[PDB]
Amino acid sequence: IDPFTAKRTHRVINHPYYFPFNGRQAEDYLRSKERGEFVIRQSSRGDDHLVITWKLDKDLFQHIDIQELEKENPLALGKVLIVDNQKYNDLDQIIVEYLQNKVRLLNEMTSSEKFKSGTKKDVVKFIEDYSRVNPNKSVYYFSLNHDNPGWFYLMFKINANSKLYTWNVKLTNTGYFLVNYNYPSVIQLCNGFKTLLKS
């Protein structure tokens, strides 16, 4: 276990969005901010890790791990940065190509007619009540997974008397990962899902 920590050995990163916050302090700061707003900060441990903490929704934040490679020395920002096993050349590239694309896809989903706001329980009750309006027709909705920031639930009933099933969709910077495929848009994600039901 690494004694190089944000508390004992603080690094300063030369970027206008770098803050001296830890994870909790970053979340608290972002509580009064809007979706997509973020801070770059040191990781709790390691001289070669940074984090971008960003806000998805009310009380919902994600901490993006950044691995630094090709560091000149323990303090220098790595000349290569890995996020989600993808290479980036600098922090701005991560912010634009990774973060902002994730935000774009988040917005796309929560603005879709197929998305339902609320907790998992409240959404379950809604789908159940909703499927009984037209008992013979299948229903499905996406919702936010608050336990695991960055994931959506995909809940669906074949009909009113069928079991309510729940699948997991992961938000990525290039689309929505369901099962074993990354769908570039919500439209294509919905088409994929309907194809899965027919296998």
List the domain boundaries for the chain: 1-107, 108-199
Q: CA-CA distance, 45 to 77, in Å (whole number)? A: 15
Tell me the residue type at 21: F
| Same-fold call for 1-107 versus 108-199 | yes
CA distance to 42, 60, 87, 175, per residue, from 151 (Å): 24, 11, 23, 12
Burial class (CB in 10 A: 0-12, 13-18, 19+), 9: middle
Q: CA-CA distance, 137 to 167, in Å (whole number)? A: 19
- Residue pair 179/189 in contact (Cβ under 8 Å)? The answer is no
What is the resolution of the experimental data for this entry, in Å?
A: 2.1
Residue whose entry in the numeric block shows the structure tokens 């009310």:
58
Instruction: Specify the experimental method.
Output: X-ray
What's the CATH fold of domain 108-199? SHC Adaptor Protein (3.30.505)
Tell me the residue type at 41: R
What's the CATH fold of domain 1-107? SHC Adaptor Protein (3.30.505)
- Residue pair 159/137 in contact (Cβ under 8 Å)? The answer is yes
Q: CA-CA distance, 128 to 148, in Å (whole number)? A: 23
Q: CA-CA distance, 141 to 96, in Å (whole number)? A: 29
The set of residues, in sequence order, having a beta carbon less than 8 Å from that of 56 and lying 6+ positions away, is 35, 62, 106, 144, 149, 150
Q: CA-CA distance, 186 to 199, in Å (whole number)? A: 21
Q: CA-CA distance, 83 to 69, in Å (whole number)? A: 11
Residue whose entry in the numeric block shows the structure tokens 């700061």:
29
